[PDB]
Design a protein around this ligand. Sequence first.
Ligand SMILES: Nc1ccn([C@@H]2O[C@H](COP(=O)(O)OP(=O)(O)OP(=O)(O)O)[C@@H](O)[C@H]2O)c(=O)n1
Ligand SMILES: Nc1ccn([C@@H]2O[C@H](COP(=O)(O)OP(=O)(O)OP(=O)(O)O)[C@@H](O)[C@H]2O)c(=O)n1
Ligand SMILES: [Zn+2]
Ligand SMILES: [Zn+2]
Lengths: 148, 148, 293, 293, 293, 293
Amino acid sequence: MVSKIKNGTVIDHIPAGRAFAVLNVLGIKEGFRIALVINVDSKKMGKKDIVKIEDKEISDTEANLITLIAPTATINIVREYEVVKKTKLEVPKVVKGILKCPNPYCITSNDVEAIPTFKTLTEKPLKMRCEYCETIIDENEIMSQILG
Amino acid sequence: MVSKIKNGTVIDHIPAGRAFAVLNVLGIKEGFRIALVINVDSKKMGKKDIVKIEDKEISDTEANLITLIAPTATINIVREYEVVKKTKLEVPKVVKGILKCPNPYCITSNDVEAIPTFKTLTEKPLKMRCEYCETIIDENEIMSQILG
Amino acid sequence: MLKHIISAYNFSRDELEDIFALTDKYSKNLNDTRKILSGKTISIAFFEPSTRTYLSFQKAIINLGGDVIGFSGEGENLADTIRMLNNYSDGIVMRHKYDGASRFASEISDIPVINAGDGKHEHPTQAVIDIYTINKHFNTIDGLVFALLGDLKYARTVNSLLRILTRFRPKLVYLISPQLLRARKEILDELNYPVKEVENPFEVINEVDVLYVTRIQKERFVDEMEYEKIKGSYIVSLDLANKMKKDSIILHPLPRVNEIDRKVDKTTKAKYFEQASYGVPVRMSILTKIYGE
Amino acid sequence: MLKHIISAYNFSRDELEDIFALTDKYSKNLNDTRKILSGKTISIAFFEPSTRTYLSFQKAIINLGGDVIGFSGEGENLADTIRMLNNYSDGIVMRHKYDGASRFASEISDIPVINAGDGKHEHPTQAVIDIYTINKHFNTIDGLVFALLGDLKYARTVNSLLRILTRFRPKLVYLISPQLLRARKEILDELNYPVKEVENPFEVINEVDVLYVTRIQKERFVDEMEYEKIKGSYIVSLDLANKMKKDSIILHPLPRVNEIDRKVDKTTKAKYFEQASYGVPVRMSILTKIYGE
Amino acid sequence: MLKHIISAYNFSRDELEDIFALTDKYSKNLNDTRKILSGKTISIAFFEPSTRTYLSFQKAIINLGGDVIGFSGEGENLADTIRMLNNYSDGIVMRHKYDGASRFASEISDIPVINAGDGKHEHPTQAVIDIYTINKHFNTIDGLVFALLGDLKYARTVNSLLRILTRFRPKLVYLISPQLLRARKEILDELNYPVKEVENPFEVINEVDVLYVTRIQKERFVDEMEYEKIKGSYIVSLDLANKMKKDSIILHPLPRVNEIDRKVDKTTKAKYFEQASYGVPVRMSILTKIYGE
Amino acid sequence: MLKHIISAYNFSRDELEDIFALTDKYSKNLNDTRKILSGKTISIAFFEPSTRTYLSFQKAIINLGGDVIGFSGEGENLADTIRMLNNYSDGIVMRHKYDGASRFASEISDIPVINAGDGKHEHPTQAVIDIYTINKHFNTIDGLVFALLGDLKYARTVNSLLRILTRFRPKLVYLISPQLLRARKEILDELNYPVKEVENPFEVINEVDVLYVTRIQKERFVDEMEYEKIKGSYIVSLDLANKMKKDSIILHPLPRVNEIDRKVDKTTKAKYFEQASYGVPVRMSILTKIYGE
Ligand SMILES: Nc1ccn([C@@H]2O[C@H](COP(=O)(O)OP(=O)(O)OP(=O)(O)O)[C@@H](O)[C@H]2O)c(=O)n1
Ligand SMILES: Nc1ccn([C@@H]2O[C@H](COP(=O)(O)OP(=O)(O)OP(=O)(O)O)[C@@H](O)[C@H]2O)c(=O)n1
Ligand SMILES: [Zn+2]
Ligand SMILES: [Zn+2]
């Protein structure tokens, strides 16, 4: 439902309603064109969202952050109108900035310069560990932090 | 850059970057398709944003709330692919919910059920007045509340 | 018809004159006053305590045959509290620390809500008492020259007084305050009569019919020195009193601390004690317009 | 015959049905209710303050022609205090922070003592109000399916509710709490009807006729994190409400803080406001059984 | 090479053995110890006060020829504070109420940061002191049977001890705590040696070589009664001491309150006073590995 | 010759240049600095606590071979206290909450008194640090364009800075503050160089060589709303930084709270960390002029 992009990144197969969260996850919310469609039809998912960012090629690092809320997602890098790359999304090893630590006594919950940092402990059932205080968070806490 | 809509509302001529704020202003962030393009070319404005909401016709009431952050905006109601209406955006008389009262002692700043309510005092230089405590807010405070 | 008493704006000139007459009647304290609140319970919900205003309303209600329940002081919602008082009572008189609390209460409530003070916003029944006193003395409110002295920024009584005056035709209202405590632009723009901001009372004291004082408080100024440098000239002194016209009056909605020299008490110009003594009959009157008509 | 109201156990099934009928009568607020407390003084001794319950009883007493004396807040003995109230009054309604305070008071006292809350023990007149509300809605209490949600360990209202239910025949009472706040073994062993402890409400929400909520408080858990991890699922949300049967009701003895989503208020299932509105007539009823029979 | 001392994990088995040898050397308090901190200033930044650990490090530093600056107690940023200490000093020893404070400090800092306690996280130099004491007594750490007694959930010393043990081969570590204060799953999953959770010490006391106690605190349990019911069995009593093997030792990182019966002091099994007396030489050692190699 | 350091006025242009040179020498931290305080004890009497400034002086003194005694915090007389320090020591560095405390101390005292802050009066050694930093960067102080941003009324550092500048020839000093926090007429009348009061920094930010910021505090304004309305424009933001000239510097005598956007830290214009790092050598220098010449 949105036109094709000359150069940039297309993030397809986002769960319905979650595009806004994807942009947050990426720190995008300036200069470059962005398109979103929300709640559009998806043959395999029922509904989906699509994000299109002109003139920016999301890295494998930036991209893996998406898997936290949109593990189904597919990342296409677009050049001259041709999709030149279709990234394999993986669970990121480390998450700096996006997730806060639920421990009110964690240094990351008190010092503005102390940026929250989580290291993935198991991908299987997804468990992440705060690198400062060792508090563990699950997929629930993760998704309820970013989605709401 | 986004395809035409079969039925719904198109909000065109939003200042660049402000589409997200328009949706907030409208309480939209479920079920129905939404499209945004951000930072696209505009002959008259340099850059603009466009919002498209399928299957919903924004009222003159809902619409006037947009003027607070996008007074340039134009609202088109779309049916069967034809634009059946091009709303005249006006400064809304009353704003309930969107704007908070800067007075920390205002009842609306303390009781969850006491919903902030502002009555436009002058459209000219835009000044609004809290209906509970009489605190006055200007266009600056208004825009810094919604935009950031 | 009168129901919620939230702003001085709730009153028309007609309702005020009516209230003055009823006050005159209730003043000459006959033992056959009509018990218009008989079988009714008024709740006195003083979230922010004030014993003077509490007792005034209670006495008013007692005089009218009403029963009194209430509380003074002390995470429940205002809304939920107002819903509760509606189970228990037939009217609410509330005082609250938050501006607009009475307006909001009156929106939740089926029974009448009477604002006995909401933050730094209004104190509308005080304004009725104030102008009743003035009207009693001069047989008019129109054409009088006023001077408000002290804190004109954070005083709900000043606010309510300025707004109630707009149902009349004052010749002039002098606004005498330190620079810091000037009436808010917002409020002054509502007014429909001549106003004039001034800093020292002795400059104009000779002209005023009504001198209305409020307290200035230390915990407000840039530092403790400014207050100390400014405070002594917003005190009503014996000297200032003596410079007033023969027929002039000095008002103050109590309590006072030190803002009036106590020697003023003995001059015939002192009217603040008479002012407090109309509290009951005036509030009887307001209640009578809400429930007895 | 009813005299001291200390436990929900003081009531028989017969007395409750009688009380419901009297409540029905007092609800349809006729102006000719019999003044059974005329010439009598009830003292309201709220050692532990609660303004909602204070005012409820006071209004009840006023409606019945009684005079009210009492206190709220503030090394004298409970016993000595109870002896003093016996000089001054014909019945005592007390709320106290110590468990068993009402039982002890009633042992010292010649005049009736009514327990309006004793520590974390009981709140028996609340339970009467709770079941009256339920019985009004369903025309029965027998055969209903209940769910208690929130804190089931330290909530006197829960205690009083569980105990009062034993005069009836509930189909089932679900006990939905975090592990930490489970009903005490002691209390559950008293019960004579099916009970079932569960941790998540969505597992059984579809079955319940009556959902009764209490607040969970931070200052109780091992650490602040546990609370934060557990709290969001004992909140009555709009989603939980929508999953209830058409004819089901949600109760809560007020005040609430944040344990009920305020959108629930607007659904027809919300019954907590109606519940509070029976407070007066129910307590009128209890007083009527103590003094008017 | 050792630099920041933030976790017990910073140490290898090799570094620990080296530290034990240096501790042995510094223990036999010769007056010719090498002044490796001569011309150096260590800052002791105790945001959370502890005088015992403060003085221990200060003495260590003094013994090594260092100068000491620091503070104890008292909206500046931790980061900014750490940047400031880098102007003033050549190493920082910090204790802080926030978990991970030392880790973060060491990331901001160019000079070495030594964690003397960070919230409820770790106390790594204590663990070095603990195992040095054990190794001194048994000539081994491998193959020993341990029992941790008291609070095993919120005790940084327990955390640091459990983690440091993973550089060795303990036969078994018993975890004796009330249900509420069990070692965190997170921490136990790190471990590479047999562990066994138990509730009562008398069940296994006969097997342990090392009994390590921590205090349980009231302000933690569901209510004051639970604590009172549980507390008496995590006290090291004379009876429990007498049931230990002849060659066994009792440790505790001070201060104690009442968790050890003072009669235990006089038995040859009491090792907590000897444990505290190695504080200085052990910390001298750690400092020597950071600055003297 | 320098002895008591009470005001920025104690320094001549000649003494400052000398101090800059000595600071340059002490900065290049050679291990053969002359121990001019050997055998001397300086007392650090911080009646009003500040750990940053405490530690700075202590380190300065340590670097110079001095011994340090002192106190921080806590009805004895200032005079009596000063007499006591004269028994114990050879110089006093004091910080006090009362204006003029250092001046008075220096009148009672035989040994040198150094003012590390007296109420809202002065902080003269900070001003030396400030201008040393500026002189290091620009190779001049004469002819520079300054802007003071934040609180210019109650900031001893601003006071000391304005006064020390009078030994030089600044092109212009912009005074950017809200109306409420303007430099005192008293202080401005002392000055011998162009000054210009302005309210918004973006109006002149393009001209300034040196931007010097202080914090504005809520507990100062008429009400909490004014502060909130004014505060955001005396914050050093990334935008304001980017609008400065290429060769310009941003200074701030620490601690900061939120008055500088932390992203500024990473720009080459940020000089506040370098500023704090000269604290020690500058104070070494001042001490050297007092005791080593
Ligand atoms: N120049 C281009 C190329 C494609 N796209 C978008 O990015 C995705 C491109 O994937 P593509 O390989 O072109 O189509 P599919 O093979 O169907 O993608 P997939 O197999 O991953 O579903 C599509 O959503 C398309 O709308 C685009 O916006 N601009
Ligand atoms: N069925 C339709 C009709 C139009 N539009 C969009 O809504 C606006 C329609 O305005 P229209 O009258 O069709 O075009 P213009 O005359 O150029 O609009 P305007 O004069 O207001 O700039 C355009 O942004 C167009 O992309 C749409 O999405 N679906
Ligand atoms: Zn953490
Ligand atoms: Zn308001």
